[PDB]
Design a protein around this ligand. Structure first.
Ligand SMILES: [Zn+2]
Lengths: 394, 396, 393, 394, 393
């Protein structure tokens, strides 16, 4: 059961939800429709259950990555945006909310990796990876390091790898093709061989995790770390003279990071899909609205072009955008699980020297392409051995 | 092995099998060639085992859907009917007897669903789904129901779902494309939401199965059921005044049931495939032949144009045809196993309301469709039910 | 939770339930306490679910064989009859309502196999199996047969097999030992070898079913069958001149058939256990009570000595008793599945002659003694093989 | 094969392990013999693998419950203390270190459940279970509770159940007999029926787990919890006036809890079984020794009579002892696995009321007790849960 | 395949079957009863198939170890030799042919493991294991080994292990108790720790199989192998000066090898059990009989006292006897399957050093018991692994 004529809205308890509620009152003051905004426990896992049985909210607010899983289950309602409203948003945001060539959510905000540098230590930062080795040995003259970032998690390593040629799955007709993987590409191999070289030349350490990488930059012992908006107010706490800016270009081409787009989805189970649209298109996603939310707790960069330009007076925002603008969107398909697990190993084995670059990426290429093929075989094969125990038994 | 000169046939003990043996003598009385007819028990499951070893009959008679299973194993022999003989039969039947664009069997009968009505209680039948709520409340006012039919088996429910645009697999040129499924499309969603509406309005009950649905119409307690030829002579047993006709049009579009062709294919292990052809082409599949079989136990509709037109003076036959003619041909491919199992569940969850319509059809679309991109979801779907089996042991 | 002060009582819809309800009125009009007697659907399978959860009836009427399964689960109340009330019932019936040396139900009726004979064809019945060959060939000269019974089900064949010394499990000091099986034994081998001889000499057929056995006697084509009280009402209908009497003795030892003891068990979930006892001991199990129930639908012979002596003027009762009195009580322990499964085959294979006597009984000995031992291995073996499959994921 | 002359010890990293190394120095200062005392992680699981292959320590320190598993594998050496040294220890400890009528290990510490009460809220402790209803409704006068303890785990509930007559297995001579189980006895049924009554009457709550029970007493919300020594350092931290005392007596008879004896067993693969004995008998297990270890991290009550009477000047020790002394010693044999599994369920089902008391204890009796007549029923029980697994797939 | 009057015998075509046929004619020429003696393919596995159907031979000749499996299935006939005729055979041979204190077959040939020595290389062989390391070094200086035998099969290793205190299952009054095992005891531990030491000191090698062990002794490259009668005529082939003698004493106690007694029992389906007895008691088991069979193909040692002493003038027979006499009889019970499998592993793990002695024999002890309590324990192992399994996934 979901009542007609009142918008019920779910959104994460750390986001500008009170800022959204203020757009809720302005909505009631114009059309007399009551808006209710809640941050209930594990709302991302709760939504699936209540959305299937016809219950839950009208509008749902979460990372685009989960909305693939919803859209799959048929739990999201398609959106019908006029030509005008798509021009009001950045065009790459729409590529983040397309499931089987259909728009399924309104995009809100953008969250991508950036290169953070200690302005004191490095007044003019490097625009290319290639130059960072040169810069490292200069800073070893003061016993400091040029860069340290989390090497273990491939979320961080991938931006470099992708630059020349690397991709996870290929986007075709507005849908990812799970056969077509870019782990063994010329540029992906080339990228990792460069990153391995940095570790083997001792310009970086294989042990560098998030804990060490942020710690080292924040205590000024390294000149640069890689981390997006979430890590910023830990560097404010250390009061380090810091700038956030574009990631360095490998083989001249920009680093392609992965993006966590905040999106507004409409419940397929809502009767109030028209009000939801009216609200979202013409109240929330305007300079007045996003401001109200942003001012409660900031969104990083935003989907609305007009207001992004105003937020982009802050260069840390304008960098996080330009990096997301140059990067690829996080695939919402669940074959990513297999992709991560393999690439995580390939970095670690190339780091330790358990395998060569080309040898490790080859294992991942096979493990990632055939992750769809792997799970089904483990499934069907265990059911065949289940049937072989019981059918005999009687 | 199989004796040279002598034809041996298997056919089910519900069919006019002695009547068919009489057509076997008509072959012996014209060319001196001997025919044996057997009604062996579980002949459809026996056939695979004896047909692989080289043994069994020359001719087998069974539903085309099972001949997919045989054709795969290579135990049916390809057929060469002249272009003329294809014009002698209805052309849509031939689309039910082809496997990977090659013919394996001669089609005989067509068994499709119809909408049957208690003509006392409603003399002139409803020609849309649209008006069923209106008609239901008319009958409830003195203690009858408009419609009641088996909701559990999707063979019955699917006709409505398919109407506006639903399909199982996309048939192109020669055969079905196993990636392209039509379970989540606009018309399939629309169809089910209408069937859900009937249950949520209390115009019909989610529990209504074959046992209750046939029982209640035969006792006159409801006006209309949906049922094929098999349930005719059980309405004769109750002797309730019944008329059988075309299914009602949803969204102006025809209702589309699945087409159950009784088919005659030929053992690859036969030396006597030419006699088989001679017999089948120019004895069984002739107005004289089918009549002899029909008169032992009736055939419903038939593939042979000339004799269907004679049987179709009976409007109940002519209806069962017109509904098969407007419906979609029953897939012989083994992705139907997945298609049935999932759609069966999606109906039941949409019926109870434990899932929504859209949520259930989405699960079926994923569970039925057999593309590369589905694989991870069918993978995750089996492991999520598997680990729920391991849980049950431990807490006991 | 089962409301206090009031007895709810459950019994099979074919038994004298209205006759019991009248004992219910006599209870209400003497102590002011309401008796509720029901014919609930599948009451034997309903009881386990409701009785474990604390709901259901106070007092329950069923074959003793299921009350083993209940008593094990702890769903029955232990009962305390004075020494006098134990003498009021036949003493062998008490051995049928004992689980792990504890009494768990009151024994009511007795239901045992008897030798039914066509007085027309056989005016005086045979006292030994041994003499049936002599009698048989005389009656083949008349175009008839001396004996036919269901040979498939070992419930029928077993009484003969047991005679000289065969047993399923040994009942010792008021507890069954599942180690001690008597399927391969001097008397069990001897018994079957005699039954095999009858089939090998063509004095019987291996295919003889219940369907054929009843048919043949009731249409007079055979002179004797073995069958308990339930098959009486089909012999009356064909109006055949029939007498029922004690089973023939092999080597001078009694044929030992099996017994279906009707019992009254009390829910451990009852608060009204005192009234239950009061009712059952001093209303139902009295000449007045059982009569009322007996008159609604008859019970064959009965556990209450006093009223059995009145019922026993009917010789069909007095036979069914004397045969139960001389026979073995049905084990309530669930290792019996293994006993049946093996012995069922061993009869059939010895009958057809696919196995010899001693060879078949030996297979059953190993299958029956270690059927108890097998089930746990088949269980643990599938769980260890399941865990090896799930590990792979 | 472990080096001759040098004693090498394992012990859990929570115990007075440096204090034990100090006994290692006093041993080296008396016979010149070198001592290694080590706290390797998961040493209870590590020992099985390394001890079979001939590797690992000479001496191992753990709860006797695991030493059944070791003794089975033949990994412990049989030990010969003179009649005098057996009199130096409490005699009931020896029945905790006896496997197939053979001594395997020297007993050290005792860890038993006790009734700890908030002397502020309840100056005098209750001496009977019977009294708990009376005292419960008294304490609702300030909205307080009489008792809260973990009702899920049968280590806690068993003390009451056993009191009138319940036992797991019967001890006759040196041997526990796995035929004779006491889960369905008059006293075991009576015990649980009383514990059920407390929940039925709402004098206690079915939800009560360790997390809530310890939390609530630490916040002074209730008058008494049940707990062994480990929870003492949590009640000091919250600053609650607590006394430890004897467990309350059901039907007049003692609450009989299970005894968690810390013991030193000696590797059968050690050549230094002579040094091991010399050390343990006449250094560690003397007033001077245990004190040294106790002073690093306290040992609770102890097996050595001599030192226990000095430790027992602390009444909380002397109570914890008295509860072990009046309780039953923790069975080392592996039918306990079955015993726990069933009794865990039977409590929970009798607590919720989904089975009756008698119905649940009967299920556990059948599921646990023996393997001659019971075999068919535990067999039927596993096939019925197996068939419940195949059911789920559909 | 069984006829009345005519005796049909099955025996393996490695044994003196023609020598038995000569006893067949002497039987026909004295009591007029014709013998057929056959060498059927796979007759040990064939017998169960056609002995269950009532057919087969009347009399069958095989190792006593298999007759447990038959007797279980009920396929063997009981034998009644008078008290007098038991004195004619060595009494431990009768202890090989007993199912639940009832005799099933007549024992004919004794077969045990023996210590064979290269007479040239060691004229007087050692009477203790203890001295083998010392004696090995004496031969190592002349580029030879003291001892080599198949270490894979525990049939060979067991003689040493058993000596001090090892047994498989406890024989009490003519019955094996399958719970009571002697694998994890003082003398078994002591035995293996000695044999492990031989491998660890490199006085012997773990890789030694039968193929290598026979090869090495027969080519004279080692001074001693252990092997029974079957391996004699292969040592003749490259005839080294070789002698067979008693096994060495561990801790002063005899080595106890396993004894594979040739035995002759009776089809339960035979009518000719009395002729069978007549033949076996008073024709085959006489000096005249065994000689005739022995002369076709030698049987090594024999059960018949008088003729064994005449065969025993050959010391190689008299050794094979004395070794069987000091050894323990092979159990006919099929729980041996489990016992062997475990001891096979315990050798391998003690050989490699993957387990210690005590660790390995403990695993075997638990693997070897198979009874009421032991099945329950491997059941306990599955429930303990189940509880760990759900938490992990
Ligand atoms: Zn009308």
């Amino acid at each position: 059961k979901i009542e007609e004529g009142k918008l019920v809205i779910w959104i994460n308890g750390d986001k500008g939800y009170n800022g959204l509620a203020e757009v809720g009152k302005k909505f009631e003051k114009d059309t007399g429709i009551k808006v209710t905004v809640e941050h209930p426990d594990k709302l991302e896992e709760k939504f699936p259950q209540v959305a299937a049985t016809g219950d839950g909210p009208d509008i749902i607010f979460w990372a685009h990555d989960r909305f693939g899983g919803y859209a799959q289950s048929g739990l999201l309602a398609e959106i019908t945006p006029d030509k005008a409203f798509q021009d009001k948003l950045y065009p790459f945001t729409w590529d983040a909310v397309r499931y089987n060539g259909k728009l399924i959510a309104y995009p809100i905000a953008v969250e991508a990796l950036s290169l953070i540098y200690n302005k004191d230590l490095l007044p003019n930062p490097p625009k290319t990876w290639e130059e960072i080795p040169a810069l490292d040995k200069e800073l070893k003259a003061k016993g400091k390091s040029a860069l340290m970032f989390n090497l273990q998690e491939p979320y961080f390593t991938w931006p470099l790898i992708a630059a020349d040629g690397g991709y996870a799955f290929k986007y075709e007709n507005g849908k990812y093709d799970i056969k077509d993987v870019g782990v063994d590409n010329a540029g992906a191999k080339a990228g990792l061989t460069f990153l391995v070289d940095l570790i083997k030349n001792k310009h970086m350490n294989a042990d560098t995790d998030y804990s060490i990488a942020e710690a080292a930059f924040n205590k000024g012992e390294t000149a640069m770390t890689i981390n997006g908006p979430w890590a910023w107010s830990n560097i404010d706490t250390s009061k380090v003279n810091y700038g956030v800016t574009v990631l360095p270009t490998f083989k001249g081409q920009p680093s392609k990071p992965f993006v966590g787009v905040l999106s507004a989805g409409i419940n397929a189970a809502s009767p109030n899909k028209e009000l939801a649209k009216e609200f979202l298109e013409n109240y929330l996603l305007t300079d007045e609205g996003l401001e109200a939310v942003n001012k409660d707790k900031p969104l990083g960069a935003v989907a609305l072009k007009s207001y992004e330009e105003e937020l982009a007076k802050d260069p840390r925002i304008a960098a996080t955008m330009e990096n997301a603008q140059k990067g690829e969107i996080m695939p919402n398909i669940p074959q990513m699980s297999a992709f991560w697990y393999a690439v995580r190993t390939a970095v670690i084995n190339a780091a330790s020297g358990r395998q060569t670059v080309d040898a490790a990426l080859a294992a991942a290429q096979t493990n990632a392409a055939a992750g769809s093929e792997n799970l089904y075989f483990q499934g069907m094969a265990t059911l065949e051995k289940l049937m072989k125990a019981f059918e005999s038994l009687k």
